[PDB]
Amino acid sequence: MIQGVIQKIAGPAVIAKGMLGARMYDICKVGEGLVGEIIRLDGDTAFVQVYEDTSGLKVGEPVVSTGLPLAVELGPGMLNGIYDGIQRPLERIREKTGIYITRGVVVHALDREKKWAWTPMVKPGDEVRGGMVLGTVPEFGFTHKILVPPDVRGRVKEVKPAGEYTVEEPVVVLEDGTELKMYHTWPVRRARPVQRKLDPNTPFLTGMRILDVLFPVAMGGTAAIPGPFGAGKSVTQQSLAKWSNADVVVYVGCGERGNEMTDVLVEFPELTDPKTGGPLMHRTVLIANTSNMPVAAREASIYVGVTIAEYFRDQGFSVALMADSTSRWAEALREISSRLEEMPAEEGYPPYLAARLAAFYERAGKVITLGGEEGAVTIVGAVSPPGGDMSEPVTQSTLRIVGAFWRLDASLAFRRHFPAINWNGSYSLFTSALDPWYRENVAEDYPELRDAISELLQREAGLQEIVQLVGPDALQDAERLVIEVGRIIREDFLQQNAYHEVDAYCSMKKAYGIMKMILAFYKEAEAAIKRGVSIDEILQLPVLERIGRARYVSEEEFPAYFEEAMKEIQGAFKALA
């Protein structure tokens, strides 16, 4: 335990003497004790960057080095919790100090008082390796597995029987004297090890037809969305959290403004998990930071969230991680870089911004955990450039490493088109690798139908000049048919109502059926147009109403409705002749 005294104070910078032996990036207590970080060593001198305000400190006050870098506590008790950027539970902070966050307060991330039902799964004399399972704890209906720390080896000497214990209890003691508790600590800036990293050949089902079909993301992939005002980004994120494949949802705020963070904090406790009746928060972890909180917390929030997600997938689950605004995190990084008097690279940002963004985004993926089980982390980070320009360096750096890009647009939201993803600007890079899974699990001709729908949308979009110039009535029959088919697609397949009881979720089978119905109607209408039938007659057909109501059909009732509509489609054309 390295102890020293203060030599010089200048703003957030503190110079401590007598600190020989203190390591480079350890966490230190400054003063009576404010939490700081060592950033430089010189002889007996250590430079400490204090997280909080240093006003009122005096020369000679003690400085203590904890001897460990920034880290998080991984164990039972994180679900249904709200944390700041450095894993400080805000609920207990409020219970202690009230509405303000007084400086120098100390609380533990995991509650030391609650008792958990231990269930051993190991026997004395058994060899253990990092990542193996030692026991089991229930948590809100989940089966929490107690895992050996990644860098711990040995054989079991004794194991405690089943009962009630706190997280501080040394449940398993190795023969070399090492005691294993229900939790361990891991540095936030080191990636947790894996056995192997697998290929992206399975999809991450979002529940939204447009995202699932046109711009899919692979299980363990990455995606990015903009944040324009009025585009309904928050409801899209909530629906994604509700209807995903992920067992656990991790949400990071990283420096959002106060009122938006308040809305986020007061909306999730109201959501209901579709797979049960309980609240959605029972399998969710929240990390919230406002713009007036310390900059170091805002910078470390992203890493804390991704480390928690990595731990949860190390348990063997699938985790969805959402970053609320990476632009604010980049702003905090820029400010920290400016504090060190570093040379700016371009538009004020440090030259290593892309390296940090890559180091964050590359932790995601589907892996084989050290315990031999399979897990995955999927990251959907939002980027909100000030002014809406995509040439801003953060957006350019993000778009070079993400696998997909879902361009939210306010123009679509202005005309009540939701979820309001612009299909012209969006793209995805996982379709080619995901095609075999689509063939094996949905339908053999699914990629062909998807390509046909995309081509129809492209052709409909290519005619926007003529229709805007002269009007729709002045077009030919084929062009008018293309326009009307595009309208049918937009109003029946891409559009989705999140608040509806049955329309909120749509499997791949229902989307495939709707696409097949639309394509069949398009081909029948083209044949009828070739046989001299008028487009105005075609637009009056009753089967269009049946097609439009397809998306409000229950999942189990869908196939019969699909068969009936497919029969009606060919009936409406051939029988009339």
Partner: protein, 470 residues
């Protein structure tokens, strides 16, 4: 009374003192010179060898042989009281109204603590400013930060004074029917001149609005550290009142551009490398610490609302100051030089203005059930009229349809009657009445964004409103 005389260096605004390790960092000190005059200062850096003090005023007359330094307070604090209402201060809490000092109920550090994110709640209720362009189209909700973007020659001070002496809450519209919670206005002016000072004093005295207001006035020739400290003291008083006496507080910061310039000067004086465009690299954090002190709190009936005012340097919205201010707050109100030159006051341009919390502050339990639809219909109609007015210049009026002529006349009348309200105080009902009278100029079925029931309930009124209030 500990005293220090080991001064070994004086240059610019900085002076060094030896054997002063008893001074806490950031303390406030007063420097006494040979003639007996006392001037203040603040500790910038303290070490074993010497401490660095930045002097508030100029360093004329100081010498290394006679001057001495004494401690005043370890941490800058302000003595607040419930009787500060009706008083004027100079930015460091010193009365300048000619009245005796207040007795402090307590003393609080001006660098307040951050609010707990789990202790906030959703802003829900609105404030009536008496300006129809703001109340109807850019509604101000309690707990919001809605800045005003101004120009160089535009009359932002007049708008600030009018809002200060007209703003009020409307409890009877929410069904309460009781004026239980008082309303107070905290006015902070940074880097103003003598003319603006006299104007503000006259405006707050002539209408009796001083009886419910606290004024922190910092002139342009005052020390820049006072300019730094003024908003923090104003917000400390506002938070104290709101969260210890259940007040509804509206805070107005007169010029944030002066604050940013003073911050840049202070940062340069301490030998710090600037950031983008020569501004301090931590300017975003400082602005956030100022702005994020407003809001509403779960379990409390008080509220804090901020209306920052800033002049865009070159009428450029990409300048760091407006860029960060808009990146922190929840919208903006934009002043227009074209409207100002055309003789329209207040010159507020509705098209680039935006309020991001308006939807929460309007509805059926508050204001009126047709508020939002009327607002967006007015927005679309005005945009269409402005677009048509540009084409009528070249293609002539007779080549236009009848609906385009209707839109042109509507735009002209909207500018002439809605925005140009002068020094009048319009309630929300009067503003909605004028809005419906203007919308009645359009055809019955042209109001495409409004539901049928509201149209049948309010359409058809004629223009007899601005003539009744000369």
């Amino acid at each position: 009374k500990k005293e220090y005389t080991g001064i070994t260096y004086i240059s610019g605004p900085l002076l060094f003192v030896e054997n002063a390790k008893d001074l806490a960092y950031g303390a406030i000190v007063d420097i006494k010179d040979g003639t007996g005059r006392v001037r203040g200062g603040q500790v910038i850096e303290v070490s074993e060898e010497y401490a660095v003090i930045q002097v508030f005023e100029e360093t004329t007359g100081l010498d290394l042989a006679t001057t001495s330094v004494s401690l005043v307070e370890d941490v800058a604090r302000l003595g607040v009281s419930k009787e500060m209402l009706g008083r004027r201060f100079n930015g460091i809490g010193k009365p300048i109204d000619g009245l005796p000092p207040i007795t402090p109920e307590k003393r609080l550090p001006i660098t307040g603590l951050p609010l707990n994110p789990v202790a906030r709640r959703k802003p829900e209720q609105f404030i009536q400013t008496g300006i129809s362009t703001i109340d109807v189209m850019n509604t101000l909700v309690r707990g919001q930060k809605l800045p005003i973007f101004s120009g160089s020659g535009l009359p932002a001070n007049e708008i600030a004074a009018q809002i200060a002496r007209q703003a009020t809450v409307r409890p009877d519209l929410s069904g309460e029917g009781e004026k239980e919670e008082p309303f107070a206005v905290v006015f902070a002016a940074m880097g103003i001149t003598q003319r603006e000072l006299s104007y503000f004093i006259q405006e707050f005295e002539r209408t009796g609005a001083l009886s419910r207001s606290v004024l922190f006035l910092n002139k342009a020739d005052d020390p820049t550290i006072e300019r730094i400290l003024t908003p923090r003291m104003a917000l400390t008083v506002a938070e104290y009142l709101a969260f210890e006496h259940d007040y509804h507080v509206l805070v107005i910061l007169t010029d944030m551009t002066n604050y940013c310039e003073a911050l840049r000067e202070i940062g340069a004086a301490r030998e710090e490398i600037p950031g983008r465009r020569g501004y301090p690299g931590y300017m975003y954090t400082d602005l956030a610490t100022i702005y994020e002190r407003a809001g509403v709190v779960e379990g409390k009936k008080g509220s804090v609302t901020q209306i920052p005012i800033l002049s865009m340097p070159d009428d450029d919205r990409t300048h760091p100051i407006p860029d960060l201010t808009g990146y922190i707050t929840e919208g903006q109100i934009q002043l227009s030089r074209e409207l100002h030159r055309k003789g329209i006051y207040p010159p507020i341009d509705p098209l680039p203005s935006l309020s991001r919390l308006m939807n929460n502050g309007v509805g059926k339990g508050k204001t009126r059930e047709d508020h939002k639809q009327v607002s967006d219909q007015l927005y679309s109609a005005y945009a269409n009229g402005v677009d048509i007015r540009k084409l009528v210049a070249i293609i002539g009026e007779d080549a236009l349809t009848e609906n385009d002529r209707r839109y042109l006349q509507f735009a002209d009348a909207f500018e002439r009657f809605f925005i140009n309200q002068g020094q009048q105080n319009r309630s929300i009902e009067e503003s909605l009445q004028i809005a419906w009278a203007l919308l009645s100029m359009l055809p019955q079925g042209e109001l495409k964004r409004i539901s049928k029931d509201h149209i049948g309930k309010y359409y058809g009124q004629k223009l007899e409103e601005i003539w009744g209030a000369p």
